[PDB]
Amino acid sequence: GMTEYKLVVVGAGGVGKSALTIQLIQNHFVDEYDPTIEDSYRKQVVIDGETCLLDILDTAGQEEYSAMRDQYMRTGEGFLCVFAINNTKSFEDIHHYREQIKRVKDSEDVPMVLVGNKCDLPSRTVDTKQAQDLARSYGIPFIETSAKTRQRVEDAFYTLVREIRQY
Amino acid sequence: SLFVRINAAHGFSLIQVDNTKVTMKEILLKAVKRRKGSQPQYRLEKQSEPNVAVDLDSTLESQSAWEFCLVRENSSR
Ligand SMILES: Nc1nc2c(ncn2[C@@H]2O[C@H](COP(=O)(O)OP(=O)(O)NP(=O)(O)O)[C@@H](O)[C@H]2O)c(=O)[nH]1
Ligand SMILES: [Mg+2]
């Protein structure tokens, strides 16, 4: 008795895709690093006064499961492209995710947010304007999050729903 | 890598397994911890055999299946 939105969290291994998802769904921070193959979580939420069902797909950063991307990228309605602010390699890796999503969607615009996670940590190797400029080159928002402190976690997921509703 | 699909009340989880000698108990415990957190009693059912609990002491190999439903004991799939 409500609309469902299919959100997908992508990014390199260890950036905190699972931690972000579990902080949103369960209000809990996962300390362990248990690499994901694939997991989905559904939760009823209120966004801008409107109740809806989130269907969040948590995906693998490990290259061993890269063949799965074709499937989930086709039906995903909005994407969090996550890197960790202390890992420039994960920032580099954003492009290959964005490019594969673009190809599968025949170069359409797709609801998407660039997420720089682990903003609670003191070590920062990705520059703020560098990240803002990557987001601007893709035409998408940049949001700094922490799955540990919950900073901007709802903002990141709810922005996708706001975009899906308008598109 | 080998894995099994666990269908639960609010989504699915793919659970890695080293081999088919793993017990069904080990799979259930991994699925519950990921999806529910720290600990209600749960059972696993074969996808093609609803409403029957799998023997948790048996091996994955003995089940001849790679997809299971995770169900709270007072509920159904
Ligand atoms: N300090 C801090 N640690 C975080 C944050 N998010 C995740 N972590 C930590 O980073 C590690 C990896 O997190 P996880 O969510 O498993 O990463 P992932 O992107 O899902 N990895 P994979 O692609 O293998 O599934 C864990 O130890 C987790 O606690 C965060 O915002 N801050
Ligand atoms: Mg993960």
UniProtKB/Swiss-Prot annotation, chain A:
Modified residues (N-acetylthreonine): T3
Effect of G13R: In lung cancer and bladder cancer; somatic mutation
Residues annotated for GTP binding in this entry: 11-19, 30-36, 60-61, 117-120
Places the protein is found: Cell membrane; Endomembrane system; Cytoplasm, Cytosol
Taxonomic superkingdom: Eukaryota
Signal peptide bounds: none
Residues with glycosylation annotation: T36
PTM sites of type N6-acetyllysine: K105
Keyword Acetylation among UniProt keywords: yes
Main location group: membrane
GO cellular component: cytoplasm; cytoplasmic side of plasma membrane; cytosol; endoplasmic reticulum membrane; focal adhesion; Golgi membrane; membrane; mitochondrial outer membrane
Keyword Membrane: yes
UniProt effect for mutating D39A: Decreased interaction with MAPKAP1/SIN1
EC numbers, comma separated: 3.6.5.2
InterPro entries attached to this UniProt entry: P-loop_NTPase, Small_GTP-bd, Small_GTPase, Small_GTPase_Ras-type
Activity regulation annotation text: Alternates between an inactive form bound to GDP and an active form bound to GTP. Activated by a guanine nucleotide-exchange factor (GEF) and inactivated by a GTPase-activating protein (GAP). Interaction with SOS1 promotes exchange of bound GDP to GTP.
Annotated consequence of substituting L20F: In OES; somatic mutation
Consequence recorded when altering Q23R: In NS3; impairs GTPase-activating protein stimulated GTP hydrolysis with unaffected intrinsic functions and a virtually functional effector interaction
Subunit description: Interacts with PHLPP. Interacts (active GTP-bound form preferentially) with RGS14. Interacts (when farnesylated) with PDE6D; this promotes dissociation from the cell membrane. Interacts with SOS1. Interacts (when farnesylated) with GPR31. Interacts with RAP1GDS1. Interacts (active GTP-bound form) with both SHOC2 and PP1c (all isoforms) to form a tertiary complex; SHOC2 and PP1c preferably bind M-Ras/MRAS, but they also bind K-Ras/KRAS, N-Ras/NRAS and H-Ras/HRAS. Interacts (GTP-bound form) with MAPKAP1/SIN1; inhibiting K-Ras/KRAS activity.
Name of the protein in question: GTPase KRas
Originating gene: KRAS
UniProtKB/Swiss-Prot annotation, chain B:
Region (SIN1-type RBD): 2-72
Modified residues (Phosphoserine): S38, S75
Tissue: Ubiquitously expressed, with highest levels in heart and skeletal muscle.
Subcellular location: Cell membrane; Endoplasmic reticulum membrane; Early endosome membrane; Late endosome membrane
Impact when changing L14D: Decreased interaction with KRAS
Highest taxon, organism lineage: Eukaryota
Effect of R35E: Decreased interaction with KRAS
Function: Component of the mechanistic target of rapamycin complex 2 (mTORC2), which transduces signals from growth factors to pathways involved in proliferation, cytoskeletal organization, lipogenesis and anabolic output. In response to growth factors, mTORC2 phosphorylates and activates AGC protein kinase family members, including AKT (AKT1, AKT2 and AKT3), PKC (PRKCA, PRKCB and PRKCE) and SGK1. In contrast to mTORC1, mTORC2 is nutrient-insensitive.
Family, similarity comment: Belongs to the SIN1 family.
Domain notes: The CRIM domain forms a ubiquitin-like fold with a characteristic acidic loop, which recognizes and binds AGC protein kinase family members substrates. The SIN1-type PH binds phosphatidylinositol 3,4,5-trisphosphate (PI(3,4,5)P3). It plays a dual role in mTORC2: in absence of PI(3,4,5)P3, it binds and inactivates MTOR. PI(3,4,5)P3-binding relieves the inhibition, leading to mTORC2 activation.
Subunit annotation: Component of the mechanistic target of rapamycin complex 2 (mTORC2), consisting in two heterotretramers composed of MTOR, MLST8, RICTOR and MAPKAP1/SIN1. The mTORC2 core complex associates with PRR5/PROTOR1 and/or PRR5L/PROTOR2. Contrary to mTORC1, mTORC2 does not bind to and is not sensitive to FKBP12-rapamycin. Interacts with MAP3K2. Interacts with ATF2. Interacts with MAPK8. Interacts with GTP-bound HRAS and KRAS; inhibiting their activity. Interacts with IFNAR2.
Listed name of the protein: Target of rapamycin complex 2 subunit MAPKAP1
Interval of the full protein contained in this chain: 278 to 358 of 522
